Amino acid sequence: MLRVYHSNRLDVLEALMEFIVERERLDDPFEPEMILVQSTGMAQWLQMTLSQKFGIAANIDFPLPASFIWDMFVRVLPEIPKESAFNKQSMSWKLMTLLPQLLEREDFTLLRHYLTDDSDKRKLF
Amino acid sequence: AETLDPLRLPLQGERLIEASAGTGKTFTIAALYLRLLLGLGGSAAFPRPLTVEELLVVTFTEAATAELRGRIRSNIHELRIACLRETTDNPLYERLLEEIDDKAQAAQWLLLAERQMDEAAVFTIHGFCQRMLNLNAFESGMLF
Amino acid sequence: TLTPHQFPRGASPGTFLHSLFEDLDFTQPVDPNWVREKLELGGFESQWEPVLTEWITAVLQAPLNETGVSLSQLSARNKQVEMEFYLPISEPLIASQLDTLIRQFDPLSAGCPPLEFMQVRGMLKGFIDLVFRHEGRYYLLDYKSNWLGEDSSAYTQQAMAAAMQAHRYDLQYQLYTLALHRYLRHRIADYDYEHHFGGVIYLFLRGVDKEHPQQGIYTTRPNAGLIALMDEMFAG
Amino acid sequence: RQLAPLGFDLMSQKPKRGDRSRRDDDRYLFLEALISAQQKLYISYIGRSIQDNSERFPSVLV
Amino acid sequence: RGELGFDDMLSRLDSALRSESGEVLAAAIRTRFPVAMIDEFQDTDPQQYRIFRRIWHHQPETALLLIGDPKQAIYAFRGADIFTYMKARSEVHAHYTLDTNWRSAPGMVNSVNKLFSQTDDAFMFREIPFIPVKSAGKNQALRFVFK
Amino acid sequence: NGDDARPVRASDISVLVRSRQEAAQVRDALTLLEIPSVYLSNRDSVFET
Amino acid sequence: GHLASLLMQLNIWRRGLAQERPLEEWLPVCRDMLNAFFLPDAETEAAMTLIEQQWQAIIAEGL
Amino acid sequence: LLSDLESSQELDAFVDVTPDNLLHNIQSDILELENRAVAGVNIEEFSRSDNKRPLDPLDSSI
């Protein structure tokens, strides 16, 4: 199942997390304990408080939720590449390659006015 | 040149208000801002109430814009408390209060505008022009 | 004829060596195109590529500690690449108190002009290079790139120990072993230390060759009474 | 901190529930800053500009 | 270089509005901001007046409240124009004026009114009629004594 | 003002001039009779002192 | 003489950096700049490696 | 979004805060989801002012 914990302060929640991870112990001693966070500071605070309670906090991974969901995609479904072909950067270079070919298509008149007046590719970029 | 009462001004077409020295341009702007917010006047009213982010006010100096924004928010807060209490001391707020038909609706509208004050549309000319060009960059043909 | 004894000094070449041993496929043979492309990324000349492949394949199959030999036979199931640990140190660490038990228990405590520090509380940042097991006996590993040992004479058994007394690598011994000890206590359900530890290897990455026993590989077994007293000193 | 949307973005016209924008983001960070303070709080803002001795108002949140 | 200045922004919006897509741009601005209150209209420019004219001069369900004071256009050197205000006054059919005066002394308002009503056509232009203002009721008792 | 009253202090007097030359022209005499005055529209940069 | 060597290098490279070339030809320009104008010290290796890394990453996504 | 899930099994741990300080007053009002602000619709409420909470003049939480 999926368990949702509501609380008022992060200390109670982090103590509940410590209580769970001390109550039920991992099978494989080399298996990382994956915790989803967003920033670096929250990862640092979680590491320091876990170390203060247990004695050492290692083999803890702190991935972004997008990377975690992508790793779940890779592990569950097959024939999926490690990194997608659709990032922020590679799609920008693809749109560089594609836009002048796709212009003059009876529906890109405002883009034609934007780009075709003058360009040292700065507007296009 | 007709004399001006801010509760009788028709909000259509163009109006050229000539406010002399030491007269209360800020007071006139606050009164017309509240009237535009709440939709009052009847014949001299805009045909719909307006969201606070659709009230363009263009002012000279950045410090003047900050002062005007503070004045407008304070007047909104005082009028909202007046609409909640159904009673007031300021004569302009008294005239407004007897002008409004539905005071609970007025209180809700003013509460929403006051909470949305932090993105109000008060600009200098060079800020307004930059914002609208950055919006319609495709028509303007200029970078991002 | 190029050799690892002729490889230049610096910290960026050490980072190059660490990056080479970051992303490997130990069981699989080395891809020559991939390693020369990695050499392209590091801005070195392509003249050192074949001796680099030979050096990598030599160190891959090295019998480090007479069991778990030929670390090309390291399964991805039982590896752990580049852990990071935070270890709390409360009740301020008196330098002389730690040096007392370091002198008492550690046999390598002869070269001690110690204690370049003052009592600091809090945590302890540290990065273990690789921790892996060979049917129990979790091996602790840490690669090191080191000096221009022109021949193998600079990579003997005792010059290594003298140099590691010179750089105070023994504090790295007790800190890393206490980290791994408390980590296995937190993770493995009720283990015995002398049954499951099988610890330290400090692989001197340079100065290893093709067919040469005990050249560039060093092994320490902690005294197992040092660790318990030290852990009690930290968490008293 | 103001970050106006791109204008031709299609999330700005018709929004939905879980959508994220910077104004709501910064307001919620102020709320969580108020909640997470356990013992004491200290809010400070520039009142009067030191050059012309004008008046400069606090934020709407304060 | 890719930089931009304030006059560059005004001229860019003006030329974009005066171009062929200016009708589309004006429709967008009309829909987004369908009323404008220009504070301090007496210090304006021909560029700003042309922008406001092309955006809000017609196509109703939109208002525009130019608020100004032509007696105080003291910014000829900065680039502001009083003739632009006179042109706008000629174009706009409605005219309004506030009556009271709050700050000044009740004798002081009368003194300034007498000084500027010394002759007909005080400001040497036909389009600026100095209409006298009356003092506020609450300040009919200001006084100053010096020994 | 009405029945209330207050004494005149130094902050209750303003002097209006049109240029910085005439501002210094009044400031020098004002300081010569020892009246401390500040020029509120000073466009002088800090590095010109 | 040393200043004139500086100017000769600057003139040659402002001649060389003018045309438009594809990204495969833009790859070694950063390495040429760094090893032709800078003498790597112990302090400067971090910044030089970071600059080469960022330039390489940009052209790597582009390629 | 969280209460819209189907299979989720939700639990709480809401530690209370004792209202003594100004900051704890505000945090408790946030937590228990109430509204102690006095508006004064009726004049017998608007005149009297003993129904809000007292504030210690030596209290410097906020």
UniProtKB/Swiss-Prot annotation, chain E:
ATP binds at W102. It comes from the Bacteria. Disruption phenotype: Decreased degradation of DNA with free ends that is unable to undergo homologous recombination, which can fortuitously lead to more efficient viral infection. Cells are deficient in DNA recombination repair and have increased sensitivity to UV light. The cultures have many inviable cells. Cells cannot be transformed with retron Ec48-containing plasmids. Coiled coil: none annotated. Belongs to the helicase family. UvrD subfamily. The N-terminal DNA-binding domain (residues 1-929) is a ssDNA-dependent ATPase and has ATP-dependent 3'-5' helicase function; both are stimulated in the presence of RecC, suggesting this domain interacts with RecC. Holoenzyme reconstituted with this RecB N-terminal fragment has no nuclease activity. The C-terminal domain (residues 928-1180) has weak ssDNA endonuclease activity as an isolated fragment. RecD probably interacts with this domain. The C-terminal domain interacts with RecA, facilitating its loading onto ssDNA. Interaction is decreased by ATP. The holoenzyme may undergo conformational shifts upon DNA binding: the nuclease domain of RecB may swing away from the DNA exit tunnel in RecC. When Chi DNA binds to the RecC tunnel, the nuclease domain may then swing back to its original position (that seen in crystal structures), allowing it to nick the DNA 3' of the Chi site and then rotate to load RecA. At high Mg(2+) the nuclease domain may swing back more frequently, explaining differences seen in assays performed at high Mg(2+). Heterotrimer of RecB, RecC and RecD. All subunits contribute to DNA-binding. The C-terminus interacts with RecA. Interacts with YgbT (Cas1). (Microbial infection) Lambda virus GamS protein interacts with the enzyme without displacing any of the subunits. In the RecBCD complex, RecB has a slow 3'-5' helicase, an exonuclease activity and loads RecA onto ssDNA, RecD has a fast 5'-3' helicase activity while RecC stimulates the ATPase and processivity of the RecB helicase and contributes to recognition of the Chi site. This is RecBCD enzyme subunit RecB. It comes from Escherichia coli (strain K12). The chain holds residues 346 to 492 of 1180 of the full protein.
Curated annotation (Swiss-Prot), chain G:
Disruption phenotype: Decreased degradation of DNA with free ends that is unable to undergo homologous recombination, which can fortuitously lead to more efficient viral infection. Cells are deficient in DNA recombination repair and have increased sensitivity to UV light. The cultures have many inviable cells. Cells can be transformed with retron Ec48-containing plasmids. It comes from the Bacteria. A helicase/nuclease that prepares dsDNA breaks (DSB) for recombinational DNA repair. Binds to DSBs and unwinds DNA via a rapid (>1 kb/second) and highly processive (>30 kb) ATP-dependent bidirectional helicase. Unwinds dsDNA until it encounters a Chi (crossover hotspot instigator, 5'-GCTGGTGG-3') sequence from the 3' direction. Cuts ssDNA a few nucleotides 3' to Chi site, by nicking one strand or switching the strand degraded (depending on the reaction conditions). The properties and activities of the enzyme are changed at Chi. Belongs to the RecC family. In the RecBCD complex, RecB has a slow 3'-5' helicase, an exonuclease activity and loads RecA onto ssDNA, RecD has a fast 5'-3' helicase activity while RecC stimulates the ATPase and processivity of the RecB helicase and contributes to recognition of the Chi site. Heterotrimer of RecB, RecC and RecD. All subunits contribute to DNA-binding. Interacts with YgbT (Cas1). (Microbial infection) Lambda virus GamS protein interacts with the enzyme without displacing any of the subunits. The holoenzyme may undergo conformational shifts upon DNA binding: the nuclease domain of RecB may swing away from the DNA exit tunnel in RecC. When Chi DNA binds to the RecC tunnel, the nuclease domain may then swing back to its original position (that seen in crystal structures), allowing it to nick the DNA 3' of the Chi site and then rotate to load RecA. At high Mg(2+) the nuclease domain may swing back more frequently, explaining differences seen in assays performed at high Mg(2+). This is RecBCD enzyme subunit RecC. The chain holds residues 562 to 624 of 1122 of the full protein.
